[PDB]
Design a protein around this nucleic acid. Structure first.
Ligand SMILES: [Mg+2]
Ligand SMILES: [Mg+2]
Ligand code: NA
Ligand code: NA
Ligand code: NA
Length: 312
DNA sequence: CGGCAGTACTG
DNA sequence: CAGTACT
DNA sequence: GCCG
């Protein structure tokens, strides 16, 4: 990134708007920052600034103050609440509205939350794993967690396919959590496994807490056996084989990649989800056949991108 | 002016 | 439903 | 915040 001196200031304002709930302004900042991060040259002109997609007048103006001044004055006026709102919304299950409510109620520290706040079941689990959930794990450990899930799943039906998606599949050296997609080529035997599979993982001691337990998605907490291990977030999704390519695509991400591809699909009168790519979408349409990820790219008129170049 | 991805859970 | 979360 |  040629524009660290720019984007590092912008990131502070983006995070500030985010934790304060100004989601769309933060979105604009987030995209500007990637746009700036993916420019070849340092931005050295206001008009050069407006040249890059995702940078407007207001944003070029800030990039200008940074290069002429070395600083961005708006940084000096960020509310004193922002570090606390960030502290609070880093609890899994607490977002901006909960953080703002806790702040208005006078809480300022996790000790205040622990001792005085009313916590949802999810938030109490998030709080007890506060540090662990802020840490990314080495890739090798994500491999171990995926293989733990796969072996428990293959014990029940050997035909079950399990693949770790998310940052793992995009090839990253560290992973925030582990994202495992499960299906079955029979198109049928994926059904009803969760009860058995989760109980198998739980009976082993691997699964330590459940956050979400849906008919298709599980979000929870695991910890590998032995010393020196931290608790890690684990997401598992079980899908029908007919949806495998769109489910793989969604679950591999990145999030910004998914949103950009879904926006593209919408411009073309299509709709893309983790269930299907649909066409003739009136704004339900027809589901288009997508046996592989490449089919999704092709039907959208895009060159195929391997998971590693989806890391937007 | 107004969308900015589309969906699944929770209570 | 509003809130939060997954990519 | 940006953009159609
Ligand atoms: Mg992940
Ligand atoms: Mg995840
Ligand atoms: Na631009
Ligand atoms: Na949170
Ligand atoms: Na207090």
């Amino acid at each position: 990134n040629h524009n660290l001196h720019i984007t590092e200031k912008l990131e502070v304002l983006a995070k500030a708007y985010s934790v304060q709930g100004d989601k769309w302004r933060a979105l604009g900042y987030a995209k500007a920052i990637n746009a700036l991060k993916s420019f070849h040259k340092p931005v050295t002109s206001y008009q050069e600034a407006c040249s890059i997609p995702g940078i407007g007048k207001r944003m070029a103006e800030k990039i200008i103050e940074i290069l002429e001044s070395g600083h961005l004055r708006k940084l000096d006026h960020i509310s004193e609440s922002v570090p606390v709102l960030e502290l609070f919304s880093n609890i899994w299950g607490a977002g901006t509205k909960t953080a703002q409510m806790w702040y208005q109620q006078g809480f300022r520290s996790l000790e205040d939350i622990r001792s005085q706040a009313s916590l949802t079941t999810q938030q109490a689990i998030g709080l007890k794993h506060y540090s662990d959930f802020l840490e990314r794990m080495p890739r090798e450990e994500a491999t171990e967690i995926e293989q733990t899930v796969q072996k428990a799943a293959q014990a029940f039906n050997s035909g079950l396919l399990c693949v770790a998606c998310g940052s793992y599949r995009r090839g990253k050296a560290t992973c925030g959590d582990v994202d495992v997609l499960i299906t079955h080529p029979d198109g049928r035997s994926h059904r009803g496994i969760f009860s058995r599979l989760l109980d198998s993982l739980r009976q082993e001691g691997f699964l330590t807490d459940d956050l979400v337990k849906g008919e298709t998605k599980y979000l929870g907490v695991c910890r590998l056996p032995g010393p020196g291990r931290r608790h890690r977030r684990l997401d598992i999704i079980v899908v029908p084989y007919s949806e495998f390519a769109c489910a793989l695509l969604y679950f591999t991400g990145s999030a910004h990649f998914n949103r950009s591809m879904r926006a593209l699909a919408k411009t073309k009168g299509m709709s893309l989800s983790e269930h299907a790519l649909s066409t003739a979408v009136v704004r339900p349409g027809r589901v288009l056949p997508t046996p592989t990820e490449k089919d999704v790219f092709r039907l959208l008129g895009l060159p195929y991108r391997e998971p590693a170049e989806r890391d937007w």
